Write a protein that binds this DNA or RNA. Sequence first.
DNA 1: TTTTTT
Length: 527
Amino acid sequence: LSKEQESIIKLAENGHNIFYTGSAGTGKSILLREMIKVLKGIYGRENVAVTASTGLAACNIGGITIHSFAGIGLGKGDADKLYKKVRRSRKHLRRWENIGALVVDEISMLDAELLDKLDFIARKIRKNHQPFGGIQLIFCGDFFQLPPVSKPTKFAFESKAWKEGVKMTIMLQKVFRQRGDVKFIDMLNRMRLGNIDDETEREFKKLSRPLPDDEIIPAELYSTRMEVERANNSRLSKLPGQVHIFNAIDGGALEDEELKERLLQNFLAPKELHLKVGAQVMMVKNLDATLVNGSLGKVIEFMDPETYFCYEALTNDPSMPPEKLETWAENPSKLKAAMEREQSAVASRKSSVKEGFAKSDIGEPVSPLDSSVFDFMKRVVLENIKRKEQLMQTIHQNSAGKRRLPLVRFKASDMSTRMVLVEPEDWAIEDENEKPLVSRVQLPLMLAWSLSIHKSQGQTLPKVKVDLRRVFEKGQAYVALSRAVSREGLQVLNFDRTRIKAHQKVIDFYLTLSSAESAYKQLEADE
DNA sequence: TTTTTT
Ligand SMILES: Nc1ncnc2c1ncn2[C@@H]1O[C@H](COP(=O)(O)OP(=O)(O)OP(O)(O)=S)[C@@H](O)[C@H]1O
Ligand SMILES: [Mg+2]
C-alpha cells in the first residue's frame, strides 16, 4: 500500500466523514478493502455497512447494494414513505440503528435525490440531527465515471445531504492499474477530462487489432443489454460441451404484451437461459448474506437435488466409507431419506409453479458428469477407494427424467469459493390484491463474460474487449477503456472521439477539494 | 439504450 493511501485509512480511523476519490486505477477500492478491516475493529464486524452503487461493484469490496442494505427497494418513492418501508422490516431498521460506518463505493452512480433520502431515513431513525445521524460516512468514487441513471439527475454532490454530510475530502493521484505503461495512463487521463489529440486517436484506433487467440476468454464491455447478451452468447456457443436450455415459466394476467415483454427483461432474467459446463455467471437477486446481486462465478455441472445431496456430502468427507454412497446408488429410496432431515401457504402455490420449471427429460439420455467435477478428490494404492466417482456417476444415470439444475462455483472478493445448486426464483409485478400482472419463474443467473459498462465500473480487467458503439453518458467511454491493465490486452472497436466529453459540474467540483497532501495536515489537527 | 428490489 502507498503512503498517500494509509493517510486515508488513518483519517477514517480517527472518525472523519471523508469522501475520497481519484482517477480510475488509483487503488481506492483496494485501499477501502483494508480500511474496512480496521473499522470493524472499532465499531464491530456487524456494525460496518459495506455498500456500493451497483451490486457487482459492491462485491468488489464485500458489500451489498446500497439499496439492498437500507431496505428501500428501488427507492423511487417519497422520502417520508421510504422511512416507513424501512421501519417495517425489523432487520433493516436496526441495521440503521447500529452501523457506526456506512461505506459507499462508486458513489458517482448515486443521484442527489437518494443521498437526500438516506440522510433523512437515518436522522429520523437514529434520533439525531447530525449529517447522517452521526454515522461516519465513507464515500469513495470518481465523478468523472458514470453518472446516476436518469428516467434531470443532479450529481451526488449537488445534494443538500452531501454538502452537509461530507466533513473532509482527499484526492489520490498515482494510477496503479496501468502502472507499467506511462503512455497509456496519460491517454486515459485526458480521455477522462475531455481532450484527445491525434496521437491518442491513432493509438486507440490501432487497438482494434484482434486480441490474443489463447485459451483465456477475454472480457467484453458493451454499453447495452442486447449487445452484452449478443456477446455472452457469441462466446457461449463457442464453448465445448453440451448446452442446457432453461425455459422460464411466465404469467399471468396482463393485457398489453409489449410492456409484458419489457417487464420481462428488467427482471434481469432471460426467457431462454442457455448454460454450458464452465460458463461465467452472476447472481442477479439478493438471495442471502454472501450470495447477492453481482456474484461472479462459474458453472461446474448439472445435477438434480437427489444427486447433488451425494456430491455435497462427498465434498465434506473424501475419506468417507462408500458403503453409504452405495446404499444410495443401489436404493435411491433411502436417498431422499437423508435429504429431507436437513431441510408458508402462498409459497405452496409457487413451489408447484416452480416445480414445472425445467421439465424432466424422460426421453433424453443423461450424459456423464465431467472430469473436473471429481478433481477435488484427486489430491497410496490402498486408499484408491474411488468407486466413489463410479458410484456418483451411477447416481447421475438414475436422474434421467429429472430436472437437473446448475451447480455453480461462486467467488467472493476475499478469494474464497462457495458451491450452490441454483434454484429458480420468481419475478412478479402486482397490485394490492396480490394478483401478479406479470410473473416469471427463471433461474437467477445471466452470463457474465460481458458486463455492461455500468456493471463493469470498478472492475479491473486483464484482457478486455471494448466496443464504444452505443455509449451515451459522459465518462462512460472512459470507464470501459480504463478497465484495462495494458494495451497488448485491449481491443477497441468503433472508437469514436466525436462524443467523448466532460461534464461541467465535475470540473467545478474537483477544484474545491483537498489534495493527497491536504489529507496529511488534518492528522496533526487530530494530534 | 443504463441501475437499483429476498
Ligand atoms: N498500492 C498498490 N500496490 C500495488 N498494486 C496496486 C496498489 N493499489 C492498487 N493496485 C492495483 O490497482 C488495481 C486496483 O485499483 P482499484 O482499487 O480498483 O482502483 P479503482 O477500482 O480502479 O478505482 P475506481 O475504478 O474509480 S472504483 C489492481 O490491479 C491492484 O493490483
Ligand atoms: Mg473499485
